[PDB]
Symmetry: C2
Subunit: 449 residues, 2 copies
């Protein structure tokens, strides 16, 4: 560093830590008893005096407060969960109605689950819908069904994608590339789990030309339609060639709409692109803040959860039993979760396509303005967008950038997927843009461009 | 079925469908939309016309009600989740505050999961606590950490144990037994996920030696202390010797305590057998009715989550970070869940050991009293137990038996793990005994003895 950068930092770290000395102690007091991989977030040794996450205390709409009192405008929003802001109207009415009503328990099946399923079909045009407890868990079911129906084993995922924390998708592509199998992403993930895994560059036509050369050997091909990491990239022609090649080869197309489902537009990325996959997995938003994973899609694949549907009065039976796999789970169809998932759908289905339209425009307000600021100031940053999911792209040292954003009361988190919601007022939208520009000026005066 | 029994049955189906007709109709109107492996339970094409799960509607204390408006005395207690009965004082209270006290949001770290970590430490002896979304998720991560801390791949699980839905534990015996790699449990669970599994007889004393062979090749032996399926089996000699071996072989001793943890006693299976595992999973009860799944244990293994600890002020940094592996989770340390987990913990440490001493012996009363009825009347049914988990071992058609238990107003799910709660009264114990005794009387009268 120059003498200028060192004394900017050795001075900002001072102002930051004093603003967040609540979270610093609480992370420091609880770091051992609470094992969380988020405590090491953005760890460099020369600013170690400010590496702790923000311990939040309250939230309401688009405002989140920490235990220091500080107020944040939230572009984190539960990693994608709170499309309607924190504690919206209909949601706590559901939560407040649970106290008044002697809710039913786990154990017996759910009287609400049938409705939640029909409305998901309504909004997305899938045939059958199951319920599990995380996106991780839903993705892991999805692979099992597709593997259970095709009776094959090898599956393809694309680098860049995220898909939960199920061991069978935690790979990196092969040293040899091509169609050769994946190697583990980290310690403790055994190679044996990677052998039925194949990884290919997404938006690389060479790889559509290897899904063909596997052709019949492929159980399923898992795709993050738009990748959380790279919202700007939304390849309609890649996916659609992929749809042709999988339906041609009898291979499952699995679409991961845990982030885009119910975000870009009611029908998810299925409605956007107008592509209908074999299996689609949903998460985050659809639980209304209760934990929730869902795997839905075509009956011809979904029939592996219960062997096939039947009716009363005749001699009919589940014809696919020789193909039904094993799926279980204690908190599946949770009573309160299944009811908040109703609130969300009944609200979303009422307020029309103009709930999404209004929110995509104001997210595009943000992306468009912030980028014009970046251009007429030659400042080397860019906003990328898909729906109300935006991110920052920048050769400028990222972690130091988002430290200022956090300082200035805009709570972005460590993955940096920032989201708007329908809770973000014009005050709020402007306050983000002011916080970005205050930052570029703070940071350029300190000589960091 | 003899000409006799065959007509008893047809009187039973009729009397049974009429009582639970709404659960029939709901289940049909939603079998397609809502895929759920549970809709197939106890399916036999002849008594087909009563093969539907019970759909609940409301509950409190120890009773559930179905949508046909039948009452039942719940002995399923939500698969063992509700130690405390349904909607206890403190759990529902904590809900009301969640609506009036403006919860923090997902995203920023929890300001409560530290006390829940501290509280768990007091109750179990675990060194470090980490929080996920399902018992399933907990086992999946626990193995990963084990495989990462030890740099080994191979894992032993025990036949008869249940450890959730991760594909890494969903295997069965290689017919040529021994220390051989296993076979899948269902179509679509890919054999590659069986390459590093090894499945040995629990309490076969040879299997104690197969672990001493693999000595350094085992990353972990995964043991459900008291197998849910076989509660009568409480093999302290075997486990103590399983501890000694794995310790000297530096192999992780994960103890799946999702059902045993906080049920047999506060320390759970660990406390009971006076054995400190390396890794212990927890779930079910410790969610206070919310979903939850925990992995806790010795830092020699937990440090693979963040990479080890370090302080503020001094030039420290994470040490075990070499062994740092991949974990995450959208719904981890959920603001409600953590508060109910806190709620449940506080409540537990308030009531003495008196709480458990009674629930186990209020069970014993039911267990013993019933076994004696069975010895007098020469009925081929015997009760088994571990604390407040109990089962019916019997040579009568079980499926016909529980239909009698269910129609008679005692709710028992398809998996037949039964638990009693603190909410059951003596009048409830009597009522269960009666409904059993008159089921024997009913089964006798029909010629099924
Ligand atoms: C593509 C994808 N899969 C899965 C998840 C999250 O699932 P979980 O609740 O287990 O993090 C997300 C977020 C996601 O974007
Ligand atoms: C030992 C064990 N593991 C896992 C589960 C279920 O895992 P989950 O909590 O996702 O249902 C159960 C209950 C269980 O008894
Ligand atoms: N196939 C089922 N019954 N699945 C439901 C989950 C059962 C529950 N996890 C016990 O233990
Ligand atoms: N690889 C990632 N996208 N990680 C981001 C965090 C994971 C998840 N969205 C929570 O926790």
């Amino acid at each position: 560093y120059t003498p200028q950068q060192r004394q900017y930092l050795e001075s900002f770290i001072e102002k930051y830590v004093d603003k967040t000395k609540g979270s610093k102690q609480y992370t420091d007091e609880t770091r051992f008893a609470h094992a969380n991989n988020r405590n090491l977030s953005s760890f460099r040794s020369y600013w170690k005096e400010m590496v702790y996450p923000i311990i939040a205390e309250r939230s309401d709409g688009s405002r989140m407060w920490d235990i220091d009192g500080n107020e944040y405008i939230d572009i984190t929003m539960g990693f994608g969960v709170n499309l309607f802001g924190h504690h919206p109207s209909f949601i706590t009415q559901t939560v407040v109605d649970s106290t008044h009503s002697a809710l039913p328990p786990l154990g017996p099946m759910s009287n609400v689950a049938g409705e939640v399923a029909d409305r998901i079909r309504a909004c997305t045009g899938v045939e059958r819908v199951a319920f599990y407890n995380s996106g991780t868990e839903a993705v892991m079911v999805a692979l099992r069904l597709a593997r259970a129906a095709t009776g094959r084993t090898k599956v393809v995922v694309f680098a860049g994608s995220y898909h939960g924390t199920f061991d069978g998708v935690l790979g990196v592509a092969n040293t040899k590339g091509g169609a050769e199998p994946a190697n583990p992403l980290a310690p403790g993930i055994p190679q044996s789990f990677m052998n039925d895994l194949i990884i290919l560059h997404y938006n690389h036509p060479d790889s559509l030309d290897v899904i063909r050369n596997l052709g019949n050997e492929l159980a399923a091909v898992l795709v993050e339609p738009v990748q959380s990491r790279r919202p700007d990239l939304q390849p309609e022609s890649f996916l659609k060639e992929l749809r042709a090649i999988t339906q041609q080869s009898g291979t499952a197309l699995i679409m991961d709409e845990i982030i885009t489902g119910f975000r870009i537009g009611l029908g998810g990325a299925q409605e956007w692109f107008d592509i209908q996959a074999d299996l689609v997995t949903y998460g985050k938003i659809i639980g209304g803040g209760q934990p929730l994973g869902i795997v839905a899609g075509k009956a011809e694949f979904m029939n592996t959860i219960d062997g096939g549907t039947w009716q009363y009065g005749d001699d009919s039976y589940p014809t696919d039993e020789a193909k039904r796999t094993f799926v279980a789970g204690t908190f599946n169809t949770h009573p309160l979760t299944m009811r908040m998932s109703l609130a969300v759908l009944r609200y979303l289905q009422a307020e029309g396509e103009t709930l999404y339209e209004r929110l995509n425009q104001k997210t595009t307000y943000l992306v468009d303005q912030l980028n014009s600021y970046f251009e007429q100031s030659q400042v080397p940053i860019r906003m990328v967008q898909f729906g109300s999911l935006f991110r920052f792209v920048s050769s400028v040292d990222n972690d130091l950038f988002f430290y200022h954003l956090n300082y200035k009361g805009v709570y972005v988190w460590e993955g940096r997927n920032c989201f708007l919601s329908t809770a973000h007022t014009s005050d709020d939208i402007a306050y983000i843009i002011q916080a970005v520009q205050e930052t570029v000026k703070d940071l350029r005066r300190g000589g960091f461009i």
